C-alpha cells in the first residue's frame, strides 16, 4: 500500500504512521497501571465491567460473517466500548487528527475513529482499549508538551503555546517542571486528579519536533511546496465533480 | 440487453448458484422477487391485539403518557382473537380466496396481516395497507364484543391513536415498515423512510440478508426517484450486484481474507489488488513513488469499491462486534481509498459526506442517535443514493449488545410479523432465483 | 499595507502577532471580563428572586483560563466581547430577523383584474392612493367595516404598514409617495433601469405586519395578516358587498396567486410554515441585504454584507436556535463578520483576479477553479500560520474553514461571474485545507463538503440546483454551521462583480430598500455593532401596556 | 356477489346501456376501466418544452418573479422536439415497445408523456412519474445541445423548479394531477387532491362527464382510505353510482323534469316522490299536517338523495351558467330536505357542513377562492366522503365565463395534455361499458 502522496518530510511522515510495517519510535515507558489511570474508566485491579454477556453466552445467530470475522478479545468478553481522546496543537505536534484517524484504522481492528479540528477520538472494547492507549502514549504519537490526552474541555490546538512549551490546557491535567524538565500528568484525561501522577518524561526538542511533524505550516514544509501531494487533491476534486455530474 | 455486464451469484455461505446472469436480471424494474418484496412490504401491517386490549382495559389512547379516565373497556380480544381475524379478513380481503392474509400470532396476541394486492392496484400509494386494517379490526371488535355506539371511537382511539389530529398514527396499536407518505423528504422517498433496526430485526441478524434487503430497498428507491435513470441507471445496477447481492463473491472473499487480523486498511488493499487484476483500475502515470490510478469505467470502480466498503463495515464492526463504529468506516474506507489511488470514493464522495453527518450525529448533543435508528429518508443519512445504508444494516446485525435502541427494543412488534415472511426474511436466494429465471429475457 | 486583521489583534492582545507564547491561567478567570462579571451578578440576582439557582459560573469547567477576548466588528471601530453579539443579547440582530419574518410581497395585479373584469370597476392611481390610505388604516389592526369593533393599539403596532412599487415612473408618480417605494430614488441609475424593467408595469405591495404580533406567533402568520386586511381594505375601498363571490378572488390572490413569500416552508423532520430562516433561499438572502445599492464600486463589501447577514441569521438563529438552542452558534458566524479577516482574506483574492483575469472575464471552466481557489486557500492559511494570535482568534477549525473557503468561493465567482464555480471553488478549499493542516472543522462539519464537489454540477432530483437558488433547505446544507451564510456570499459575489442589481429575484431586492424599516439593511455590520453596544431600539416591546 | 342491488346504466345522452348490473361491477375494486384511469392517472406527465426554453433563454427560473442575470441559455428546444422526445422516452420507458407515451403536441411545445407501469409496480407511490420524467428530459436536453457540465444545471432548475430547496417543484415546467405526498391531509387522500378545474378541463366541461370523473375520483380514495370498508362500503358504491354514474338515469331524469323551469326544492319535490315510488323510504308516522318518513336502508336512501343533489346543482347552476351557487345549492338542497321529510341529508350531514364552510370560503375575506380552485384534499371540502366534490365539477362545467380563477386560467397545460387520454374525458363511457362486460362475474 502507498497511503499517501508527496516528497515532503510530512507526506513520509503521514506514510509511516498509517503503515502498520512501520514500528512506532518508543519515546517513554508507560506502564499498564498508569495507562488504566490516565484513562480513567476503572480502577487498577477492578474486574473489567460488561455491557453484554460473553459471546459465548448471547447466543449469536448462525452467520458466516461472523464465523469469518474474529472478535477481539474485548467483544469476547463483553467488555464496555470506552475511549481515548488527544489534542495535537498546531506547533509541529507530530500526529495531527486526520493522520490519527486514517492510521488507527490501517493500524487497529474494531476501531470507532473520530476526527475534529480540537480533538480526535478512538472508541473500541476496554481492554483491547487498554492496549491501543499504551501504542498511543509511549510512541511517537505522543509528545507531552505539544499532545494532551482529553476526554473534555480540549481547547489550544490553535492556542500559542506557554513559556515552556507547553500547549494551554483549560484543566491543567499536563505539568511542565522546569526543575526536572519532565512533563507530568496529574489528572486523568477527564480531568480528575490522580493520587499519584505519571511521569511522562521529557518534551522532544524543536528540530526533533519538525522532524516528525505530519502538519504542513509555512514556517516548516509548507502544503503548497508539495506539489505532488496538491496534485492528488486536486485531481480527486476534478474526478468527484466529473462523476457527480455524469459517470458513464 | 441494454448493458453487457453480466455476474456470478452466491449464496450467503460463498457457495457459487448462477453463473454469468445478465447484469439487469437484478434490476429492480426486471426481477420478479424484488417485485414481490416491495409489494409484499407495501401491504403488510403488523397487529398488536394485546396492545389493543389493554389500552382499552386502561384507557391509555392517544400517545404516551395519556389517560382518559372513565373511559376503560374491559374486552377480552386476545381470547377472541380467532373470531376478531376472520371477521377482519372479510372485510380486508376484495374477494374470497384472494392474496389477504390475515394470521394469528403469540397465541393471538398479534396479527400478521396482508392487505390484498388489488387494492393497491386503484390506489395511488401504501396508507390503504394500515388503514384498511384499522377499520377492519376497530369493525370486528365492535362486532365480536357489541361495543355500544357510544363506546366505540374508544376501539378507534386504542387501534389507530390520536389520528387526524396528530398527522401520524400517534400511539397506535398497528405497525409497518413504511412511515406515512406526509414524512418523506422528498417525493420517491418512501422504500427510504424504513428504519435499519426494523430491517436488521426482520433479518433475524442474518448479516449478508440484512444487507442485501437494505440495498434493496435503498437501490429500488433510487429507481422511483429518478436517480437510477438514463446515464446513472448502470452505476445503481452494479452497486446493487456487487455491495448487497455479494456478486462474484467479492464482498464474501475481502471478508475471509481479513476477517482473522484484518482492518479497514488491509481491506482497502485487497481491494484495489483486485480491481487491478480485473482489468477495472489501472496506472495512468507515475509521481514520485507514487502511482496514479485511472480507469475508464468509473461505474464498474465504484461498484468494486462499495463492495470493499461494506466488507471493510463487517470486518471493522465485526472485529468490535459492536455497530457504533460503522460511521467511521463509512467515513475513512472512503478518505484513505482516495489517498491510496487517487480515484474518486464510493458514490464519488457522497458516501465520505453522509459518513461525516452520520458520525457527529451519533456521537453528538445535536440530534440522531445510535445506528438502528437512521434510515435512507432520515436527514442526517439521505446524502449518498444507496450505498451508505446498507453498511449500517450489517453493522447493526453484527452488534453484540451494546445499542440503548437496538432492535430488540425499537422493532420488536415488526420482527415479530415480518420476520414470518420468508422472502423479508432471506431475500437474497429469491432475488438470485427469480435473476435464473428471467435471465433470457434481458 | 498592513494586513486588515492586523489593527483587531494589536487589540486583543498582549503580544504582537507573530508571537508564538503568551501567559495563561494567571488572568482572573471570568473576572478579567466585564461582561462575565455582569453575568455573575445578574444570576444571583436572578436565583435570590425565583428561588430557584442560575447562571453561575463555579459549575462545569471554570472559563477565562485564556483571553476571553473583544471583537471588531468588521467595517467598524466599535470592539465588543462576544456575548454582545450572541442574538439573545443583541436586539438589531433579533430586529433583523423581525423585519424579514413580518414582510411579504403582495401583488395587485389580479386585485385590480377582478375589480376591472368581474367588478367592472375602474383603476386609477387616485383608487390606488385611497387603497393605500385605507390599508394603512388597516393593516396594523384596525377596523374599517363593521359596528362595535375592537382594534389593536396604533402605537404598538406602529411599524406596520403597506407601501408599493411599479416599473411605470408615471404610475409610480401619481400615487401619493408616502406610499410608494421610490425606484429611482433608492438605486443608482443603471439598477434602477434594470428593476423597472423586470417589474414593467406590475404593481406590488410591500406588506409588514406588526412585530410584536411575528414575535408572539410565528412567519407562517405573515400572509395571511396581510391579505385579511388587504381583503377589507379591498371592501372598504372600491365599495363592493362585505362578502360577496368575488371577495374570494380577492383572498386566493393575496394568499397563494400573486404572493411572494420570504421563505417556503419545510419538511416535517424540521417542519415549519413559511417565513422562517430555512426556507429562505440564498439568493432572497443576497437581495434583502441593501449593500448591493450603496457599495455597488466595491464587490467585496457588497458580498461580505451579505455573508454577515447570512452567518447571522443562519448560524446564530436558524441552527443555534430554531434548530438547536442553547449557548449556541455565535462565534462560529462572528469568524464571518470580525476582526476583518474574512474581508483581508476576499479583498487578497479579488486582486489576485484582477490582476490574472480581470473581473468576470476568466473562463467559466474547473481550470480556473483550480487556480483560484487553490491560490487564495493558501493565502489564507497561510495568515493563521504566520500570524499565532490570529490563529488563537479563530481558535476553531471550522471558523476557519468557513472564512477561508469563503474568500476562495467569493473570489472564483468574482472571476467567472457565475456563483457554480464559485461553489466549486468552496470545496475545492475544504479539500486542500484538510490536507494542509491535517484538520477541518467540527466533527460533522464536511458532510456537505464532501458530497460537495460532485453535487456541484449535478443535475439530479434532489442534487441539481443553481447556488442562488439553494438554501438552508437543500439537503446536504440542513444540518451545519459554517456554510449558508457563506453561501449567500457566494451567490451575491458574482452579481456584485458583474453589477447586477439583484441576485435572484428583484422584487425581494426592492421590497427592503425602503427606510421605513426598523433594521437598517443598508449596513448591516453597523447595526450589530450597535445592537451590541445597547443603542438600537427594536419595534414590538410591550412597555406601554405593561407596569412602569 | 357482496350485495343484491342491480342497477340500469346509461350514456350521456340518456339512454339505455345496460340493464340489472350488478353495484359491484362498478366498484373501484372490480370495474377495470376505474382501474385504467387510476393508473393512467398516477403515471401522466404533461411537459411544458415552450415553457422549459423561455425559462432558460430568460434565466427565469425557480418561481414566480425569480431570474439570475448572466445564466440565460439560448436553445432551441421546440425547434428539436421530436429529437429530444425520442431520446427522453428511451430513457423513460423500461423495454422497447412497453405502455410507455411520449408525444408531442401544439406543434412540439408541449408532450403528453406516459411513465410505464413497470416502474409503479416495484414503487411505493406516483411520484417516479414526474421524477423519472424530469430527469428523461433534462438529460435529453443536455445531449441535445451538448449543453456543458458547467450550464447544465439551468436545465434542470427550468425544468423541475426549486426543489429541493422548495418541498414543492416550485417553478417547475412539468405538471400532473396528482400533486405531491406531502400535502396530502391525511394518509390516503391522493387522490383528493385533484383541483376541481383539471377535472373539468380534462372531461372539456361537459358536465355529466366531469360529474363522473370527479366521483370515480373522489369514490375511488374512499376506497384507499378504508372509509368504504366493511359497514360503509354498500353506501359508497351506492354513491358512486346514482350521483356520479347517473345510475337508473335518475340524475338525467331530474334534470329533464326541472330543467326549464325549476328550482333547488322542485327537484327537491321530485326526488322525494321518485323514492317514495320506488320503496325506498314509506311514511313512518304522521304528526299533524305532516308526513315523516322512514327508511330501513340508509345507504339507498343517501344515494337518491346524492342523485337529487348533483340534479339540483345541474338545475341552480346550469340555470344561472354561474357556477359559483354552488356551495348554496349543497347547503340548502340538503337543508330543505331534511325538513321536507324527517330523514338525514346527503352524507348524514355532512354534504350540509361542506357547504357552509365552502359558501364562506368562497364569498369571504379569509380563504379559499372561487370554486373550482377547490379539490377533496383542499381542507374547506374534504369533510363529505366524496358527495359534495363532484358537484362543483359539474358546476365549473356549467360556467360560461363569471369566473376569474377558470379552467382556462389554472389548468391549461393539464387540458391540453390530459384531454388527449380517451378515458379521462369521457370517463362515464368507459366505466359503464366496463361494468357491463363484468356483470355476470360478480
Ligand atoms: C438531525 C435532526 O435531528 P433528529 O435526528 O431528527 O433529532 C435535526 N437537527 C439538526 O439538524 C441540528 C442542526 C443544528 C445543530 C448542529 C449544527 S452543526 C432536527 O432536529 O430536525
Ligand atoms: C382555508 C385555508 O385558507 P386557504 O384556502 O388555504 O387560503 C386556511 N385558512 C383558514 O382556515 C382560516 C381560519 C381562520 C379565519 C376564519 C375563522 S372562522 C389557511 O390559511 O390555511
Ligand atoms: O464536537 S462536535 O463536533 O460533536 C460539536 C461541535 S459544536
Ligand atoms: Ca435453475
Ligand atoms: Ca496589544
Ligand atoms: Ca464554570
Ligand atoms: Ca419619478
Ligand atoms: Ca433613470
Ligand atoms: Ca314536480
Ligand atoms: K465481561
Ligand atoms: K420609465
Ligand atoms: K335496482
Redesign the interface.
Known amino acids: 500500500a502507498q497511503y499517501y502522496p508527496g516528497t515532503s518530510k510530512v507526506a513520509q511522515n ?1 506514510r509511516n504512521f498509517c503503515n502498520p510495517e512501520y514500528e512506532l519510535e518508543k519515546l517513554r515507558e508507560i506502564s499498564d497501571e498508569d495507562v488504566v489511570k490516565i484513562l480513567g474508566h476503572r480502577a487498577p485491579g477492578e474486574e473489567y465491567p460488561s455491557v453484554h454477556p460473553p459471546l459465548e453466552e448471547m447466543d449469536e445467530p448462525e452467520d458466516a460473517i461472523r464465523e469469518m470475522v474474529e472478535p477481539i478479545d474485548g467483544a469476547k468478553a463483553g467488555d464496555r466500548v470506552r475511549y481515548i481522546q488527544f489534542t495535537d496543537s ?2 509541529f505536534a507530530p500526529a ?4 490519527r484517524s486514517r492510521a488507527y484504522l490501517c493500524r487497529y481492528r474494531g476501531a470507532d475513529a ?5 480533538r480526535q477520538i478512538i472508541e473500541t472494547r476496554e481492554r483491547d482499549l487498554e492496549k491501543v492507549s499504551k501504542e498511543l502514549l509511549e510512541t511517537e504519537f505522543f509528545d507531552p508538551a505539544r499532545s494532551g490526552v482529553r476526554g ?2 480540549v ?1 489550544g ?7 515552556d512549551g507547553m500547549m ?1 490546557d ?3 491535567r499536563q505539568i511542565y517542571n522546569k526543575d526536572t524538565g519532565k512533563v507530568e500528568m496529574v489528572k486523568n484525561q477527564i ?1 480528575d486528579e490522580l493520587d499519584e501522577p505519571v511521569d511522562l518524561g521529557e518534551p522532544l526538542d524543536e528540530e526533533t519536533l519538525m522532524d516528525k511533524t ?6 516548516g514544509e ?3 511546496d508539495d506539489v505532488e ?2 496534485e492528488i ?2 485531481r ?3 474526478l ?2 466529473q ?3 455524469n459517470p458513464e | 440487453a441494454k448493458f453487457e455486464d453480466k455476474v456470478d451469484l452466491y449464496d450467503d455461505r460463498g457457495n457459487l448458484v448462477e453463473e454469468q446472469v445478465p447484469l439487469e436480471a437484478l434490476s429492480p424494474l426486471r426481477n420478479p422477487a424484488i417485485k414481490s418484496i416491495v409489494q409484499g412490504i407495501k401491504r403488510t401491517v403488523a397487529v398488536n391485539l394485546e396492545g389493543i386490549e389493554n389500552a382499552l382495559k386502561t384507557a391509555k389512547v392517544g400517545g404516551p403518557a395519556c389517560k382518559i379516565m372513565g373511559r376503560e373497556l374491559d374486552l377480552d380480544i386476545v381470547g377472541n382473537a380467532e373470531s376478531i381475524a376472520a371477521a377482519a379478513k372479510e372485510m380486508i380481503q376484495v374477494t374470497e380466496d384472494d392474496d389477504t392474509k390475515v394470521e394469528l400470532l403469540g397465541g393471538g396476541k398479534r396479527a400478521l396481516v396482508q392487505v390484498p394486492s388489488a387494492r393497491f392496484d386503484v390506489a395511488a400509494e401504501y396508507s390503504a395497507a394500515p388503514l384498511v386494517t384499522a377499520t377492519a379490526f376497530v369493525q370486528a371488535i365492535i362486532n365480536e364484543f357489541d361495543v355500544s355506539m357510544y363506546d366505540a371511537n374508544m376501539v378507534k382511539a386504542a387501534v389507530l391513536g390520536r389520528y387526524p389530529q396528530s ?1 401520524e398514527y400517534m400511539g397506535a396499536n398497528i405497525a409497518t415498515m413504511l412511515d406515512i407518505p ?5 417525493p ?1 422517498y418512501a422504500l427510504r423512510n424504513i428504519m435499519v433496526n426494523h430491517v436488521v430485526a426482520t433479518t433475524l441478524k442474518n448479516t449478508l440478508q440484512a444487507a442485501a434487503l437494505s440495498t434493496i430497498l435503498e437501490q429500488t428507491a433510487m429507481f422511483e ?3 437510477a435513470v438514463g446515464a ?1 441507471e448502470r452505476m445503481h445496477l452494479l452497486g446493487l450486484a456487487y455491495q448487497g447481492m455479494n456478486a462474484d463473491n467479492l464482498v464474501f472473499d475481502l471478508v475471509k481474507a481479513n476477517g482473522k487480523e484484518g482492518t479497514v486498511g488491509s481491506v482497502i488493499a485487497d481491494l484495489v489488488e483486485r480491481a487491478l487484476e480485473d482489468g477495472v483500475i489501472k496506472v495512468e502515470k507515475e509521481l514520485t513513488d507514487y502511482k496514479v490510478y485511472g480507469t475508464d469505467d468509473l461505474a464498474m470502480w465504484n461498484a468494486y469499491a462499495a463492495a470493499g466498503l461494506m466488507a471493510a463495515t463487517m470486518v471493522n464492526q465485526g472485529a468490535a462486534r459492536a455497530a457504533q463504529g460503522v460511521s467511521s468506516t463509512l467515513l475513512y474506507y472512503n478518505d484513505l481509498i482516495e489517498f491510496e489511488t487517487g480515484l474518486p470514493s464510493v ?4 458516501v ?6 452520520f ?3 451519533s ?2 448533543i ?2 440522531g442517535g445510535g445506528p438502528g435508528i437512521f434510515n435512507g429518508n ?3 443519512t ?2 449518498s ?1 444507496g450505498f451508505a445504508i446498507p453498511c449500517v444494516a450489517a453493522a447493526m446485525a453484527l452488534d453484540a449488545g451494546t445499542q440503548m435502541f437496538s432492535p430488540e427494543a425499537t422493532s420488536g412488534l415488526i420482527k415479530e410479523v415480518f420476520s414470518q415472511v420468508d422472502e423479508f426474511r432471506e431475500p437474497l436466494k429469491y432475488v438470485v432465483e427469480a435473476a435464473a429465471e428471467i435471465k433470457n429475457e434481458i | 499595507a498592513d494586513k486588515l486583521f492586523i489593527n483587531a489583534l494589536k487589540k486583543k492582545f498582549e ?1 504582537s502577532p507573530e ?7 494567571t488572568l482572573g478567570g471570568w473576572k478579567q471580563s466585564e461582561r462575565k462579571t455582569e453575568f455573575v451578578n445578574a444570576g444571583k440576582e436572578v436565583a435570590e428572586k425565583r428561588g430557584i439557582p442560575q447562571y453561575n459560573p463555579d459549575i462545569g ?2 472559563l477565562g ?2 483571553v476571553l477576548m473583544p471583537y471588531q466588528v468588521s467595517t467598524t471601530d466599535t470592539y465588543v466581547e462576544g456575548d454582545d453579539l450572541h442574538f439573545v443579547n443583541n436586539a438589531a440582530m433579533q430586529q433583523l430577523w423581525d423585519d424579514i419574518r413580518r414582510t411579504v410581497i403582495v401583488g395587485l395585479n ?1 386585485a385590480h ?2 375589480i376591472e ?2 367588478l367592472g370597476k375602474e383603476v386609477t392611481p387616485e383608487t390606488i392612493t385611497h387603497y393605500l390610505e385605507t390599508v394603512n388604516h388597516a393593516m396594523p389592526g384596525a377596523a374599517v367595516v363593521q359596528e362595535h369593533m375592537v382594534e389593536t393599539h396604533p402605537a404598538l403596532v406602529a411599524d406596520s404598514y403597506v407601501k408599493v412599487f411599479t416599473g411605470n415612473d408615471e404610475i409610480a408618480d401619481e400615487i401619493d409617495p408616502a406610499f410608494v417605494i421610490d425606484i429611482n430614488k433608492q438605486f443608482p441609475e443603471d439598477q434602477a433601469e434594470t428593476l423597472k424593467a ?1 417589474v414593467g408595469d406590475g404593481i406590488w405591495q410591500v406588506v409588514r405586519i406588526p412585530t410584536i404580533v411575528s414575535r408572539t406567533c410565528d412567519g407562517a402568520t405573515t400572509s395571511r395578516w396581510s ?2 386586511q388587504i ?2 381594505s379591498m ?1 372598504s375601498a372600491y365599495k363592493q358587498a362585505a ?3 368575488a ?6 390572490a393575496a ?4 404572493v ?1 413569500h420570504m421563505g ?7 417542519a415549519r410554515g413559511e417565513n422562517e430562516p430555512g426556507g429562505v ?1 440564498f ?1 432572497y438572502l443576497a437581495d434583502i441585504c441593501q449593500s448591493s445599492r450603496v457599495n455597488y464600486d466595491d464587490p467585496v463589501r457588497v458580498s461580505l454584507d451579505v455573508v454577515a447577514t447570512g452567518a447571522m441569521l443562519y448560524d446564530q438563529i436558524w441552527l443555534g436556535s430554531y434548530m ?1 438552542g442553547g449557548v449556541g452558534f455565535t462565534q462560529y458566524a462572528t469568524a464571518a463578520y470580525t476582526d476583518n479577516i474574512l474581508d483581508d482574506f476576499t479583498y487578497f483574492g479579488k486582486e489576485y483576479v484582477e490582476d490574472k483575469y480581470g473581473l468576470c472575464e476568466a473562463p ?3 481550470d480556473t477553479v ?1 487556480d483560484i481557489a ?1 491560490e487564495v486557500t ?1 493565502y489564507g ?2 495568515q ?3 500570524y ?2 490570529l ?2 482568534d ?5 471558523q ?1 474553514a468557513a472564512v477561508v473557503a469563503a474568500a476562495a468561493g467569493c473570489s472564483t465567482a468574482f472571476a467567472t ?2 456563483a ?2 464559485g461553489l ?1 471553488g468552496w ?2 478549499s475544504m ?2 485545507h ?33 447556488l ?4 438552508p ?4 446544507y ?3 454551521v459554517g456554510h449558508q451564510g457563506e453561501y449567500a456570499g457566494i451567490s451575491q459575489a ?2 456584485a462583480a ?1 453589477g ?1 442589481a ?6 425581494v431586492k426592492i421590497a427592503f430598500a425602503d427606510d421605513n424599516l426598523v433594521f437598517d439593511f443598508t449596513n448591516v455590520r453597523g447595526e450589530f455593532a450597535k445592537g451590541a453596544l445597547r443603542e438600537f431600539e427594536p419595534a414590538g416591546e410591550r412597555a406601554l401596556i405593561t407596569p412602569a
Open positions: 503521514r498546531m506547533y495531527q487528527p486526520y493522520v473520530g476526527t475534529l479540528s480540537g473534555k474541555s481547547h490546538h490553535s492556542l500559542r503555546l506557554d513559556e494551554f483549560m484543566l491543567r480531568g505530519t502538519i504542513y505550516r509555512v514556517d509548507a502544503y503548497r501531494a496538491v487533491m486536486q480527486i476534486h476534478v468527484r465533480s462523476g457527480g455530474y | 398527522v406526509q414524512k418523506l423528504e422528498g420517491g426517484m429518478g436517480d446513472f458514490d464519488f464522495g457522497k465520505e459526506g453522509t459518513a461525516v453527518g458520525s457527529f450525529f456521537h453528538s445535536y440530534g432520515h436527514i442526517v439521505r446524502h443514493k | 503580544e508571537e508564538k507564547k503568551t501567559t495563561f491561567y469547567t471554570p483560563q485564556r389580479h383584474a377582478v373584469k368581474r423586470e391579505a385579511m381583503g377589507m371592501i362578502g360577496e363571490a371577495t374570494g378572488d380577492f383572498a386566493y394568499k397563494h396567486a400573486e411572494i417556503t416552508y419545510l419538511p416535517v423532520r424540521r433561499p439568493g438547536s467559466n471552466t474547473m483550480l487553490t493558501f492559511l497561510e493563521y500560520e504566520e499565532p494570535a490563529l488563537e479563530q481558535f476553531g477549525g471550522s476557519r461571474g457565475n457554480q464555480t466549486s470545496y475545492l479539500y486542500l484538510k490536507e494542509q493542516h491535517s484538520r477541518l472543522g467540527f466533527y460533522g462539519y464536511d458532510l456537505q463538503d464532501q458530497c460537495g464537489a460532485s453535487n456541484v454540477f449535478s443535475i439530479r432530483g434532489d442534487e441539481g440546483l443553481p442562488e437558488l439553494r438554501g433547505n437543500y439537503p446536504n440542513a444540518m451545519n458574482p452579481h458583474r447586477d439583484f441576485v435572484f429575484n428583484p422584487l
